[model samples]
Target: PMEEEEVETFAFQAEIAQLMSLIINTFYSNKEIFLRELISNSSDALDKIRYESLTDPSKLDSGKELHINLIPNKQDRTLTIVDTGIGMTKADLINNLGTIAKSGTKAFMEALQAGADISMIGQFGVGFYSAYLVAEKVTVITKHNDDEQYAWESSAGGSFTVRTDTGEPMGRGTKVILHLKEDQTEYLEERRIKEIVKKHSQFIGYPITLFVEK
Candidate 1:
């Protein structure tokens, strides 16, 4: 047995916090769209890995079957979205979660004040922050081929935290856990989740499955 390094922590940038606040307070007239955004992101991850595989076949070392899994837990009041795709490293998690990588905070604020459509929201980033509409907290557990497993968490109140995952290896890809809010329990139902996926993600290129206990 050997000692291990503890998890690292960092604060979200001030501008990012303001942008997230705007997204949480607005942009979602339909809360279920959170699942749609997450699933779409999963599909994008798979697409990236699939394209990379063309040049470097080892990118799909995990296997060729790319898919998404939605697991709802009534007991724990949590919904998890898991994907078998190219996962993210620590810096990726920080940049993606802690800030909008390609967009500046001032520009995002200007667009929001100008009444940007929902379609434009994802393009500017901040789509992931939509999770706060239904969940009090969000936890992302991801394992990239080039990085070890790590967990990124946030309450979306203002900041987030990242730490090393001391659990068993995820093999490959990412898992996002949404701790449901008291008023958002409807998302924990299997039928509801299935319907949302169908309505929003029916055309997704990857296979999406719902895992619920009978």
Candidate 2:
């Protein structure tokens, strides 16, 4: 073992590199659809935690609420989506985000190479990469009931790093933070987000609370 706080960086598998390019360029022209994918993802996590906690109720101690929080930080130029869901372990981050999906990825690459559309990407489970459509950087901070708090960070379409989180401990859940590109700051306004949530995520089962500055 090495130093406790050492940040481990991993290069994406070749397929992931190609897939992210398609996500950022070839597929989503609407850009705003990034919110759609992320809200759907948060819903999936909440679904997982709800079922798992039914068996081992101790997990509820970490986070009882199964909702999502949207915070747009104009000062920092970032949009953060937080979910009180089934947070991830270190390995879960590596496999799910960093280097993963050999079985599905090969097929995804083939389909994209054949000029498939955005819907195909969601089917193959690569919707997380849609964040790169607008953000130059993405950060994920997550904690699981059975694991330590950890964070993952990536620059647009680049290698990613994972390390122990030194910040305030979130009881249990994940936060997806998007460092908005200079041109993408329009997403920071509350009215714009409200419209998107209503158009896209109104049907999401969880209460998505967007923190509006008063």
Candidate 3:
């Protein structure tokens, strides 16, 4: 079991913060589309493991199913999206969620300035921050094949923290927990989640299971 320890936190690049605010404000019309971006990311993670197994069959030795799970907790006003795919290490968590590479942020601003289609946000990788548009806090627990299980957390503010997880093991995958804002309650509806999945991830090439209350 991974033990909890003092967290090593980092701040987002100045331009990254600027771009995220811009996205939240400019893309306000389609806030729900963040689900689509997240599901697309999960699909890419599954694809990564499959492609890796092609060169090294041992990579599939874990025998985990390539599936995505969407679990909603209405009482808690939270949504959990889990994927049995290539997970990220603590280092990856920081590099990915903490800050965007300088080059990437530059290109993102340029693309936005050029009036690129808003739908192309996911392609720049910053689309992940779109979660902040609807959720006040986000927690990610990931177990990578090469690293121990860890938790990455942020409030979509300027900083994020990464720490060891002492909770139930996630096996080999990633699980994202979104603490939804009061105004974003629509995301808690099962049908709404299903509709979004069908609209954006219908051809993801992997099973996406949404867990709803009775």
Candidate 4:
């Protein structure tokens, strides 16, 4: 549809690049926090969809159960976290990856600049970016009630890609595949994951599911 040269090249501005590195390296420092951030983000997403459904029932579809699931693969050295919440469209990928504002990057920066609590900043969908702290490569399989399913993959550091996928989620939601690091293999154990979930994410309103391989 378009010529090669006509295709525009994309790059992150210097300031955004610096902010991303700071966001990933700092908030993602504690491993025990993985579930905390994920669940909080999920709850918010579900709540948003739930509120919309009240106005437009087609959006959230009350008949379906809303929840989150964590699947770990020791042999593959990966951890997969899935949520039955509102999913994203292609535009979401660009806004999420290319810009700092949509990721709440600016708010967190301002909080630190003003000596306010930065922890409160990652409590929204923006907090989803924290996956980069544990993974070198990540994949997100998601479906929106009104749009086609899609998959987003990235290594962070300002480079990421997204593609369309087939098959609908059992309901509206997102699934994240985190390619784990060598030393992080301990996370694959059910007991360890459950303990972590209970410790940090027990207050999440939805049911948290874990798939045990044994």
Q: Name the runs in model 3 displaced over 4 angstroms.
A: 1-5, 24-27, 96-101
Give the Å shift of residue 36 in candidate 1. Answer: 0.8
TM-score of 2: 0.90
Q: Write the per-residue lDDT of candidate 3 for residues 1-214, one digit (tens) a residue.
A: 3343567777877877776667656646678878988888898889999899899988777655899999999999999989989899877877754454556666878887887766677777766777887888899999888999998888756777888898999788899999998889999998899888878778888988888786
| Alpha-carbon lDDT, every model | 0.80, 0.84, 0.81, 0.69
Ranking by TM-score: 2, 3, 1, 4
Ten-residue stretch with the least lDDT total in model 2:
96-105
Worst 10 residues of 4 by lDDT: 2-11
Candidate 1 clashes between residue pairs 3 or more apart in a chain or in different chains: none
Q: In lDDT terms, which candidate is top?
A: 2
Give the TM-score comparing model 1 with the true structure, all chains together: 0.88
Give the Å error, residue 126, model 1.
Answer: 2.6
Writing each residue's lDDT as its tens digit, candidate 1 over 1-214 gives 3233465556677777776676667646678878988998999989988889999998777667789999999889999999988998988887764554446556667886787654455666557766777888899999888888889988876667778898878788899999998988999887898889879789999888888765
Candidates in order, TM-scores: namely: 0.88, 0.90, 0.89, 0.78
Task: Report the Cα RMSD per candidate.
Answer: 3.3, 2.7, 3.2, 4.2
Best by TM-score: 2
> Where does candidate 2 clash, by residue pair?
none
For model 4, residues 1-214, the per-residue Cα lDDT tens digits are: 5354422323454545555576566644466565578778778778878787787877655246777788888888888888778877666655644564544565566666787543454643356656655677787887777677777776667755556665564456888888876766777899999888878788888888889986
